[PDB]
Structures are given as structure tokens and as C-alpha cells.
Amino acid sequence: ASLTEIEHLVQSVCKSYRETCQLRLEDLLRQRSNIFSREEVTGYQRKSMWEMWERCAHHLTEAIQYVVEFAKRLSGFMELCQNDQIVLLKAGAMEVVLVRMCRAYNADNRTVFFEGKYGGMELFRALGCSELISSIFDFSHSLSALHFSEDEIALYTALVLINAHRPGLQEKRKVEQLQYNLELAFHHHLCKTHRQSILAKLPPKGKLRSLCS
């Protein structure tokens, strides 16, 4: 890939992300000061685990629709066979949503944007998944403490999705060429913005895979 083709791949991935980012960053950042009161937190804690599961599963389904649209707008992804497109989305959609979450996470007070306001992990107590919730918050904190930008989320999530190691891929080598190109685009963008120093602080390769499995 040429240095011009890579700059075009960066722009192409960031364009797809911009069209499918679901929530405006500026609205998430403005709402940081709008925090749930103790009464509102208690209201969530009193809900049944079934009600919390219905709300969260609904928000998760909606977030996954935007990730599918992000994938459909990557010309590289659309050149893959139907089997591989399904395999990559089924294995990676949830991991992409997990990376996207860091933009809605406030590392100053350990809160996340949820249904209109920011709240801590105790908001999700009725689910009875405190170890899972803790892990999600820790993963978000590790990216949020790096001030992970919109273009870094765009390039990183494209890499999360285009993974040649996913079981069931019919054209592994085609996926790998697209993955290698996306890694070059990611590193190139980090150099132009003097952000290469985040590479050594980024979560290890399969941390998302183990968290989501």
C-alpha cells in the first residue's frame, strides 16, 4: 500500500465511523456534569434483574446496528465473502461496542453515560454481574485514561472487526491483507498526530476477546 493509499484508507475508515458513531461526542462530553442522584441510583438498584436485562439488551442491540452499518461502509469489508462478513460481525460487533463505550466513560469519577445521565457501576447492581460490570469499567478506564480520540476509535474498531484469526473464516488470507493494511493506517495516523506513545499503553491483543467470551 502506498503512503497516499494509506492516508485514503484512514479517511475512508474515519468517514464510515463518522456516519455510524450513534451519539455525538460533544453531547456525551456536555452531559458529563449531569450525574444520577442517589435517589435515581436507588431506583435502578430496586429494578428487577429482568427489567435491567431488557433495557441493557435493547441498548446493546441498538449499538450493534450502528456497528453493522460501520462494517457495511468499509469497502474492504464489502469485498469479503458473505460467510466471512457474518463471521466477523458475529465475533466482533460486541467487542467494537466495548471499544466505542470508552467515549461515554468519564475516568475522572468512574461513571458511564447510561439512559440520559452518568452513573457508577452500582447503577447495574440488580443484574448481579458485578465482576462483568467491573471488567467493562476497567477496560473503558484503560482507554479513557489515554483520552482515546474519535479517529483512534475508528481505526482501532476497524482492526477489532477485521481479525483474520476468527474461527470459521473461508478467506483468512484476504482478511489478513485487509487487517495488515488497517494496522499500517492506524500506526500512520498515530505518527501524524504524535500519539505513537499510546501503542505501548493500549490493551493487549486478545483482552477484548477474553472479556467478551
Ligand SMILES: CC(=O)N1CCN(C(=O)N2CC[C@](c3ccc(C(OCc4c(F)cccc4C#N)(C(F)(F)F)C(F)(F)F)cc3)(S(=O)(=O)c3ccc(F)cc3)C2)CC1
Ligand atoms: C456509540 C457510543 O457512544 N456508545 C456509548 C453508549 N453505549 C454503551 O455504552 N452501550 C450500549 C449498550 C450497553 C451494554 C449493554 C449490555 C451489556 C451487558 O454485557 C454484555 C457483555 C457480555 F455479556 C459479556 C462480555 C462483555 C459484554 C460487553 N460489553 C449485557 F449482558 F447486558 F448484555 C451487561 F451485562 F454489561 F449489562 C453491556 C453493555 S449499556 O449502555 O446498556 C451499559 C450497560 C452496562 C455497562 F457496564 C455500561 C453501559 C453499552 C453505546 C455505545
